């Protein structure tokens, strides 16, 4: 048996790391948290510090409000019975206002009002967090890649519960807050639009989802395959190529006759993933607004 490098053989610890400073307002960083030996076998053992600050607190508060709001409703339905609340936890559900109410904020609480409230919070929670991943990169002087990639995920999210419902004409077309509940919504959505397997953007989204799993499986296995030459130190290998980058590239060139570079493979990676929700959002936006039945559409493209 030769070492595979999935788990560390020995852990080493030193003073807690307070991280780089740059233009970060150090007054907003908490203090180092404890060290996790459990986590240290797979990766870093240090927990914290963390940077809060205005936007950070707004989201975390706004986020919990979205969380509690839903939870209030779950208890209502469970009749404040702890045993009931547990037995039917996956069954509860906060549905949006009925079709009748259209897109007004007039619907009564027990008919869609709480939904509109819970949504409003999640809407503030998410967008402020997005600004957070942008600002946190600025302070350190890094590229905005993380923020832009995350926007692609917001896209599909934004289309499912905001944009499409509006274009349709009612908060009715939105998704409900519930475990089994949103699973049924999904299955339904497909049936009502004549089978999503006929939606070309859906099939593209899947290709990228499967592709993301194939690529990360490929990329991860490779870096571990050449970690014996310091391959995970990807940044310095970009600035000064080593045997790790060479053997990594040659393995694949000899296998499929073509290859990537230490920096390049990360561009393939960010795009393969980002396209999943980019293509998805489009396929869903056009469903029910431009195309009623994808089967029919697949017969005559138009």
């Amino acid at each position: 048996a030769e070492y595979q490098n999935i788990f560390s053989q020995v852990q080493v610890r030193g003073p807690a790391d307070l991280g780089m400073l740059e233009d970060v307002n150090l007054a907003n960083r908490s203090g180092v948290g404890p060290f996790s030996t459990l986590l240290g076998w797979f990766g870093n053992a240090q927990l914290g510090p963390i940077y809060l600050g205005s936007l950070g607190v707004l989201s975390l508060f706004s986020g919990l409000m979205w969380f509690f709001t839903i939870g209030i409703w779950f208890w209502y339905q469970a009749g404040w019975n702890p045993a009931v609340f547990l037995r039917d936890l996956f069954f509860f559900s906060l549905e949006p206002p009925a079709p009748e109410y259209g897109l007004s904020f007039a619907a009564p609480l027990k008919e869609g009002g709480l939904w509109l409230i819970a949504s409003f919070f999640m809407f503030v929670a998410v967008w402020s967090w997005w600004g957070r991943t942008y600002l946190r990169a600025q302070a350190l002087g890094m590229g905005k890649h993380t923020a832009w990639a995350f926007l692609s995920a917001i896209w599909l999210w934004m289309v499912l519960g905001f944009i499409r419902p509006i274009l349709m004409g009612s908060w009715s077309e939105a998704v409900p807050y519930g475990i089994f509940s949103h699973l049924d919504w999904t299955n339904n959505f497909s049936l009502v639009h004549g089978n999503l397997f006929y939606n070309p953007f859906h099939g593209l989204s899947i290709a990228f989802l499967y592709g993301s799993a194939l690529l990360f499986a490929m990329h991860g296995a490779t870096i571990l395959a050449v970690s014996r030459f310091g391959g995970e130190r990807e940044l310095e290998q970009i600035a000064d190529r080593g045997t790790a980058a060479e053997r990594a590239a040659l393995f694949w060139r000899w296998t499929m006759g073509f290859n990537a570079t230490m920096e390049g493979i990360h561009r393939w990676a960010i795009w393969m993933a980002v396209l999943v929700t980019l293509t998805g959002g489009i396929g869903i936006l056009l469903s029910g607004t431009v195309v009623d039945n994808w089967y029919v559409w697949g017969q005559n493209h138009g």
């Binding site: 510090p49 590229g143 832009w148 799993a213 499986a217 296995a221 393995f251 006759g257 920096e263 993933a273």
Partner: protein
């Protein structure tokens, strides 16, 4: 035909079979014994799909489709025109996948690196064999396997899933979707991280892995590390597929009713199995 830094690596050695008979390259491709084997299986298999096209009466890629034997044939052999060709092609498919894996192992021994790649690939092969071999044999007929066709194989997915109500309720299916959804998130992040550090704001110096760890700590209070993120990626991936294979190896065998009904064990737990009100009371 060679990368600028390639020559020093092209040395003799590393082959598992045939010594040096097949130890050479063709353009950028390494051959090897298994390089020849996968070519053998692939051509043969392609030919057979072409002969399947004629019998079917069409050359349309969107219409061509090779079907497995009908259930009436159980696990026995069947006439080419009806399931035989499919059985033979699946053998060729299997023969080409394994050969490809072993060819990777050889490329591995020549370059002096670890065997992580062919190992990861083997999990995809296991998923394939679960749908055309393991499940079918456990159910008693090749008819339960999936057909080889662009759209006809999607129909199979749809009809197989619906045979159990909403397949969303298959519990191993839910776990498996979590790893797929998470793997993508992790891939987008890893990619964006490495790139925001190597391509900082215009004019600034190239950031370091320290900035990468600081960025994530500031954001979520924890950084897994450069080596950790590659271990995580390999894991989320192999796990997503390991549970995929699982959710299907148990469907049609140990469980063959509606998946949604499987969830009643939880609600029927005595303690609350009768308490009034709620959703199931």
């Amino acid at each position: 035909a060679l990368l600028s830094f390639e020559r020093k690596y092209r040395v003799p050695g590393g082959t598992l079979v045939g010594g040096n008979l097949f130890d050479f390259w063709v353009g950028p491709f390494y051959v090897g014994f298994f390089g020849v084997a996968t070519f053998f299986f692939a051509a043969l298999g392609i030919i057979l799909i072409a002969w399947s096209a004629v019998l079917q009466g069409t050359w349309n890629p969107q219409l061509i489709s090779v079907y497995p034997p009908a259930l009436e044939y159980g696990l026995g052999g069947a006439p080419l025109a009806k399931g035989g060709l499919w059985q033979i092609i699946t053998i060729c498919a299997t023969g080409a996948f394994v050969s490809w894996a072993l060819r990777e192992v050889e490329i591995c021994r020549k370059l002096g690196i670890g065997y992580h790649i062919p190992f990861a690939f083997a999990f995809a092969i296991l998923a394939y064999l679960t749908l055309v071999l393991f499940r079918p044999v456990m159910m008693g007929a090749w008819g339960y396997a999936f057909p080889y066709g662009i759209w006809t194989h999607l129909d199979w997915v749809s009809n197989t899933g619906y045979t159990y109500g909403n397949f969303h309720y298959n519990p191993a299916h839910m776990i498996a979707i979590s790893f797929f959804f998470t793997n993508a998130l992790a891939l987008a992040l890893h990619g964006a991280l490495v790139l925001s550090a190597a391509n900082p704001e215009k004019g600034k110096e190239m950031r370091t892995p320290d900035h990468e760890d600081t960025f994530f700590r500031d954001l979520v209070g924890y950084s897994i590390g450069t080596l950790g993120i590659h271990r995580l990626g390999l894991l989320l991936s192999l796990s997503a597929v390991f549970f995929s294979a699982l959710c299907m190896i148990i469907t049609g065998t140990i469980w063959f009713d509606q998946w949604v009904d499987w969830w009643q064990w939880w609600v029927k737990l005595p303690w609350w199995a009768n308490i009034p009100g709620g959703i199931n009371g």
